Amino acid sequence: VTAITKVEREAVLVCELPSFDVTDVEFDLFRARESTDKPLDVAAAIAYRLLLGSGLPQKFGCSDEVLLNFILQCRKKYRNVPYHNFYHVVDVCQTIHTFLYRGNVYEKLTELECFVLLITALVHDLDHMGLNNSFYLKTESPLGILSSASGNTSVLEVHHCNLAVEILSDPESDVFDGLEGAERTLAFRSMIDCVLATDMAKHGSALEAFLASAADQSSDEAAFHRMTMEIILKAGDISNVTKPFDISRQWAMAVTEEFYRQGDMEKERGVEVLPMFDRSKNMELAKGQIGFIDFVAAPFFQKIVDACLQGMQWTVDRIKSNRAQWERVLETR
Ligand SMILES: CCCCNC(=O)C#Cc1cc(C2=NN(C3CCCCCC3)C(=O)[C@@H]3CCCC[C@H]23)ccc1OC
Ligand SMILES: [Mg+2]
Ligand SMILES: [Zn+2]
Numbered sequence: 001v002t003a004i005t006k007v008e009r010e011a012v013l014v015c016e017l018p019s020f021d022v023t024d025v026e027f028d029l030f031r032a033r034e035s036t037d038k039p040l041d042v043a044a045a046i047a048y049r050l051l052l053g054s055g056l057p058q059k060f061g062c063s064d065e066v067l068l069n070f071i072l073q074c075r076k077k078y079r080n081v082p083y084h085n086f087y088h089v090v091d092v093c094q095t096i097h098t099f100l101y102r103g104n105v106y107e108k109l110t111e112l113e114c115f116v117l118l119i120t121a122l123v124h125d126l127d128h129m130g131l132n133n134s135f136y137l138k139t140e141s142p143l144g145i146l147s148s149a150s151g152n153t154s155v156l157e158v159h160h161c162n163l164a165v166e167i168l169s170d171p172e173s174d175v176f177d178g179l180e181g182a183e184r185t186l187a188f189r190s191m192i193d194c195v196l197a198t199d200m201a202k203h204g205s206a207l208e209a210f211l212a213s214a215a216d217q218s219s220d221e222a223a224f225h226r227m228t229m230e231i232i233l234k235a236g237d238i239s240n241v242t243k244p245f246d247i248s249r250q251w252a253m254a255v256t257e258e259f260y261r262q263g264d265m266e267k268e269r270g271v272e273v274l275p276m277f278d279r280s281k282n283m284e285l286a287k288g289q290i291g292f293i294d295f296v297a298a299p300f301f302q303k304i305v306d307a308c309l310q311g312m313q314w315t316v317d318r319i320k321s322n323r324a325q326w327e328r329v330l331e332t333r
Contacts, residue, residue, distance in 0.1 A: 003172055004069040011038070012068060015045035022046050023053065025098045025314060029091050030250050040075060043090045047071045047122060050097050056115035061178025069173040074122045077163055083251075083258040084128035091251075092236040093121035099232055104311035108228050112183060113190065117229055119175050120191045121236060123164035124198055128156060130258045131265070133199065138271045154199040161192050190229050197230035198237050206230055207300060214308040231304055235312075241289065241297045242315040245325050252289050286329045293323045 020032055032046065033039040048068055051057050057067045078086040096117055100106045106114055133155045136144035147155040165188070168174045176187045197206050210227040213219040240251035263277030275281045301315045 001073060001166060001170055001173075003170075004072045008072055009065070009068050011041050012044040012048060012072070015042050017042070017045060017049065020046075022049050022094060023097060023101060025102055026244055027094055027098075028244070028247055029087055029094065030247065033087060040086065043086055044068075044071050044075055047090050047093055050093055051118055054097065054101075054114065054118060056111055056118065057175065059111055060115055060176070062175045066172065066177065067175060070119070070167065070175045071122065073167045073170075073173045074126065077126045077167075079127065079129060081128065081130035081258055082261070083254040084125045084130060089122050089125050092124060092233070092239070093118055095236040095239040095242075096121050096232055099235060099309075099312055102311070103309060103314075105228070105232060105309055108308070109225060112179075112187065113225060113229055115175075116187050116190050117194070117232055120194045120229075120233060123167070123191065124160060124195050124233060124237070125156075126160045126163040128160075131262050132156075133201070135262055135266065135271075138266070139269055153201065154196055157196050157199045161195050164191060164195065190226060193226055194229050194233040197234060203234070203296070203300075206234060207303065211303060211307050228308075235301070235304065235315075238297055238300065239315070241293055241322055242301065242318045244318070245322055248289070248322050249285070252285055256285065256288065284330075286326045286333075290323060290326050290330075293319055293326075298323070 015036070015038075017032065018035075020035075021027060029043070029046070032042050036042050048071055051067055051071075052064065057064075074089070075086050078084075078089065100109075100114055100117065109117070133147075133153065135141075136155045137148065137153075138144075143155050143159065147153060147158065152158050168176060168188075171177050176184055179187055196202075206227075210231045213224045213227050240255070241248050243251070259277045260279045263273045263279065266273045266277060275283065298316070298319050301312070301319060305312050305316055
């Protein structure tokens with residue numbers, strides 16, 4: 001990991017994001033990416049602005065300089081894939097800011113936990129290649145064999161954590177260098193637990209654990225905090241369908257293309273290709289999004305808002321209205 005240059009930091013700091021309000025639930029990262037022809041420097045500057053405006057990095061002895069080095073060390077390790085690129089993790093960072101500060105989830109966590117979550121957003125998909133865990137295991141690829149041999153089925157999520165500790169091992173990009181003892185430990189353990197919890201194979205059990213804890217007034221408090229962090233990172237990670245319809249739609253286009261590519265390589269490798277990943281099945285976006293809404297996103301957001309995160313009710317309202325709009329695309333076809 002080469003150190004970040006004064007020139008690179010300057011390239012970010014110049015961005016001023018005219019009109020954009022990065023703290024708003026109606027914020028639009030697509031409009032932001034076009035507004036210039038340096039769409040990466042913009043993304044970095046949104047992330048930088050979000051982290052400073054929280055007032056958290058300052059409280060934990062993280063200089064403006066170390067914070068920007070971190071953001072740029074993260075950006076270098078993301079790839080040119082349709083969805084799991086740098087724009088996705090800047091989106092998860094911004095969305096998590098809104099859940100914390102507009103949804104009042106900050107009230108459930110310490111400032112350190114709020115700081116860790118915003119930072120974890122940016123590392124949670126490092127060096128994602130546009131292929132899911134299943135691909136690595138079905139093709140008996142090296143990373144797949146190593147996961148299988150060492151007993152951890154979360155191929156990508158363990159990879160992401162490995163790159164996250166690498167970046168933070170250098171004091172010039174360690175946003176946690178200001179921490180010591182129990183606080184530094186908590187920052188690393190909670191960042192790692194949250195990234196590992198983004199594996200959708202654990203979706204059901206993470207959701208049921210958080211709900212059983214929130215329903216139990218005698219839950220261990222440290223455990224409830226941890227599961228709140230995991231649930232918020234998960235929330236941001238499937239937050240596409242909580243955005244204004246046209247934003248939601250562009251995200252659904254980017255993820256469908258990434259899936260389609262995986263199925264193109266699964267084809268040329270002679271491995272099982274699910275309907276979802278098959279360009280030849282040419283399924284309607286509308287039916288896809290309605291499916292995701294009915295089986296994953298609507299139950300998830302409704303249950304966590306009912307159980308505990310009442311201030312996030314708008315996510316359930318926007319899902320409800322996004323589903324209505326896709327039902328009208330169908331009704332008028
Ligand atoms: C049954 C739905 C049909 C799919 N068609 C669609 O229109 C769509 C979509 C879509 C999908 C994802 C992700 N999907 N999933 C798994 C979720 C569990 C159900 C099925 C297995 C995939 C993952 O693991 C990714 C990695 C982690 C998080 C979610 C993401 C994110 C955003 C999306 O829309 C913007
Ligand atoms: Mg991921
Ligand atoms: Zn993600």
